[PDB]
Amino acid sequence: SMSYNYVVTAQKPTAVNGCVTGHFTSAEDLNLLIAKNTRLEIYVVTAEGLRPVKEVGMYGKIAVMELFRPKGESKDLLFILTAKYNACILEYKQSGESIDIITRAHGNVQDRIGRPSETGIIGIIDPECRMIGLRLYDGLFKVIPLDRDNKELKAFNIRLEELHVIDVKFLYGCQAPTICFVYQDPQGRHVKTYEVSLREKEFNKGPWKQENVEAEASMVIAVPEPFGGAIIIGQESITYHNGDKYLAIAPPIIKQSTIVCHNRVDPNGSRYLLGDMEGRLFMLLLEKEEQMDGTVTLKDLRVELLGETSIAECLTYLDNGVVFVGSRLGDSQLVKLNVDSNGSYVVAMETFTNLGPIVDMCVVDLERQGQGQLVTCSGAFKEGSLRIIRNGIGIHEHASIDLPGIKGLWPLRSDPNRETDDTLVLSFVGQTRVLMLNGEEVEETELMGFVDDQQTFFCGNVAHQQLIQITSASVRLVSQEPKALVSEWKEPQAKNISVASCNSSQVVVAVGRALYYLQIHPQELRQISHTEMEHEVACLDITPLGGLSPLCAIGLWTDISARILKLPSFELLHKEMLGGEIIPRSILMTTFESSHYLLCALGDGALFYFGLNIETGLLSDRKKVTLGTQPTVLRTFRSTTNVFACSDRPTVIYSSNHKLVFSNVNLKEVNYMCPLNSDGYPDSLALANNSTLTIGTIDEIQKLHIRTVPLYESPRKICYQEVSQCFGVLSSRIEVQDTSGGTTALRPSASTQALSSSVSSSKLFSSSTAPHETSFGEEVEVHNLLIIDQHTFEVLHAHQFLQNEYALSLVSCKLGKDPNTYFIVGTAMVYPEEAEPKQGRIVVFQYSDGKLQTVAEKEVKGAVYSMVEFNGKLLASINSTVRLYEWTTEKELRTECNHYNNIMALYLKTKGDFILVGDLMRSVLLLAYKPMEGNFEEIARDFNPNWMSAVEILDDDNFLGAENAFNLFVCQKDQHLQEVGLFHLGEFVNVFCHGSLVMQTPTQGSVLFGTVNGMIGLVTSLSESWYNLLLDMQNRLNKVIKSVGKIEHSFWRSFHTERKTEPATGFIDGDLIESFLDISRPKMQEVVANLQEATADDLIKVVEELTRIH
């Protein structure tokens, strides 16, 4: 058998890899364009911030993004080069309300042979738009002439003698196209210029040449006219060159960190923004000087500290003091630059969530309610954090009132001429209170004709401009403009009312087993019918689905039956046996997407929903879901109309492509609810708990919600320990040598602000050891194990490891017959500029009474790269060894097995008795534990080389891997492991983890993965028939979907490395499949044309079902 896999995006990439500004959408609009790997986001810069106008996806990793304006254009055009060398020129096209990104030119500029450069792909555009320059490989400069006839973006190569280019730019103010670049040779680093000639397709002698530049010169800045020239930024100095003009400064403020990005503030280059690796923001000023003749020359350079921002990957100045900080290691932000310091000139105004990099993550179900949550280790350095990702629907609360003991909510229009609710009637234990809504103000009032002494079961507006109130004693009908009691119905023998239901013109009241059908008439509650059911009535509903309902839904006590009766004869039309011994609590007739349903919920949290036929009253397609454990009450509201389910976990029911979806509301315990459409709270809801009354609006659809827990240091690994109700997190913080012969922290962080703290007292590497002294300004890493509460996410404890000890692996498990659960950490002694670590530790911690107690330690001769619990034993990877440890009764680790091989097992996963091993460069390996013989054995090995990054076991015979060239692959047994699946994902996978973020199908299994760019994906398995259908749909979709840049989807998903390239196999692009629901219905039929007896509605249900896995 083969392997068929389905990979889909759960969370799009959030890290910013690039940002440019200009007039792309129109000549009058200032735009900000953000590259997030495969996504391009287009914003309009206003005083309110950033207004989104368009977002597109590209079939490629965006490596180059530049705005430029050639002659004959009304706005700027966009040049993009992908990492697979797809080049295109794009234009923003708006036709009224339709937005199209059209391809003005496209082509692939990859060479047949060539070695990619160390500084990566560089793409520059000449200021006169004469040409596009590309540095793709060493020794070659690729030139794309910007001619009107170059529709295919044909290019030619010029031989570059300098084989190691650091950075290159096109110079301003030149009669001929001139490049300026920093290069590296055995003699150091230098800057050189060349004149590019399209006529001769060669280089000409540049205007100048500087033989020597700083050894760490890494960035070139082309200064615009009138000054021109170039600015070279290094680790220590900033220099300006322009023929015979030379300026050089060396400010000590920039020595502490490397400057990694820059941006121009003004079109003449008089001020520049600079950001370093610590998030500091600098201003580079080019000081002018007026001479005696009247000319103005460049006097000096000067930098000035502005303050602190997020660690910036790119910076973009916008309008008046507003700067966008594009970050890949933390959240992006909009910062404000003030001309007067506060000593910081920067002020953060908005933050934008970034999950990247996700270095580790785990799935937990804290409340044990059936839906898991993702807890990731995100960010790095001062941006490091934990993120909690949860599927659900958000609530925006706009009012809160402390009103305990509420037992019922009903909206009401006290005025018959208004179309807006102005009254909220509340029910309590034998009481009924009334509140009025005067705009945004709420005040308790009274309603004439209503009763405050009896608990209300229902009230609202009814026909003939009247009001109704159903209490536990009777049903009262009240006039409107002069409010007064006009009619009242009681039980013939004045017994209490058990169940109540009502619409605009009908009332159905139950008294035990007796039903009474009343009709609302002008000043008259006319009784039409009255019968007796065979069992006691539990719940009622008479919602007119097709305002005179001919049907009446009812739930019974002893039978546990949902019946549809006919008004007024009350005869039975359809009865469904629900089963069990729990009675139904709520029943509701509703309509979803023009289809009619019957909802019925019991007291145990079960929810049955059937298809309802209004003409016959026939129930069909019986299904069941679990919406909690407490009794559930159903109520409709207007978003179409949706159903709110009130229980211990609130759930909103809605529809999507004729399939019901049950989404959890991000709230705790909602006992009663009603819709509320007031002038101060339009299209809102009123929610009541055990203590407060809440008014707010609700989101339309389910999405991923993200909570952020800032750590201000780098998290590394995370594991959940249920028995302690806490997370264990390995973290690292940077410290710099001060002057007291030690290291000092640069800022407070999680490891230095915990409630309690401990330090390692191990003496394993103390005596008979030489010191590793450091120098001034040298940075060191201090590693810690954090204990994080699972509810408040506060740092309960922080244990600091030994100096120069790096925590690499973390696991939470029991071992042997020991009933305690431990945090186990694998470490390594890491010293500067050394090979593989020679010493390490395995430390067993126990969290008890808010403190971490060290239980045992085990010295190891190497780095403990990974650890996993293996059937009551500890499996550890140490350097080039896989070792199995036993937990003795004396609380010590004893070696049982030692598998000495040549692999470097950086990644370990286990299942049953097998182990999947991920090597640094030798792909994956399969080991199996022999129980009777007590050691390991190599079953099979993938023999083609793959620089692994993550590994996962899909099942007993399918093994999933990810490598450093952004590819996925699946290995299978035949011994040799055979690669039966290949797929270019376009992201760097850091962690695989089993689990799901939806409630608990055409697919099997669920594996989540987190990436460097913050993207979260999902992998699942398909059957052969489903894989063949979806593969056929891929080729049909690819013929219809227009691709930005005219990039072939199949070329994009093709497995690609430096030594190997072939199409994808065994993988379905779920993102492409899901886009089938985004095309028009006429365009839908073309896709499914002549598909095998397949209709568009057949695969709408197929694709909609596939969307439910995430």
Curated annotation (Swiss-Prot):
Domain of life, source organism: Eukaryota
Effect of residue 947 to A: Impairs interaction with AMBRA1, ERCC8, DCAF5 and DCAF11
InterPro entries named in the record: Beta-prop_RSE1/DDB1/CPSF1_1st (IPR018846), Cleavage/polyA-sp_fac_asu_C (IPR004871), RSE1/DDB1/CFT1/CPSF1 (IPR050358), WD40/YVTN_repeat-like_dom_sf (IPR015943), WD40_repeat_dom_sf (IPR036322)
Chain segments carrying region WD repeat beta-propeller A: 14-355
Pfam families linked: Beta-prop_RSE1_1st, Beta-prop_RSE1_2nd, CPSF_A
Gene3D superfamilies, sorted: 1.10.150.910, YVTN repeat-like/Quinoprotein amine dehydrogenase
WD repeat beta-propeller B, as annotated region: 391-702
Residue span of region Interaction with CDT1: 3-762
Posttranslational mods: Phosphorylated by ABL1.
Annotated pathway: Protein modification; protein ubiquitination
Entry keyword annotation includes Cell membrane: no
Segments of this protein annotated with the region WD repeat beta-propeller C: 703-1022
Subcellular location: Cytoplasm; Nucleus
Modified residues (N6-acetyllysine): 1046
Comment on protein domains: The core of the protein consists of three WD40 beta-propeller domains.
Protein's name in the database: DNA damage-binding protein 1
Organism from which the protein derives: Homo sapiens
Gene assigned in the entry: DDB1
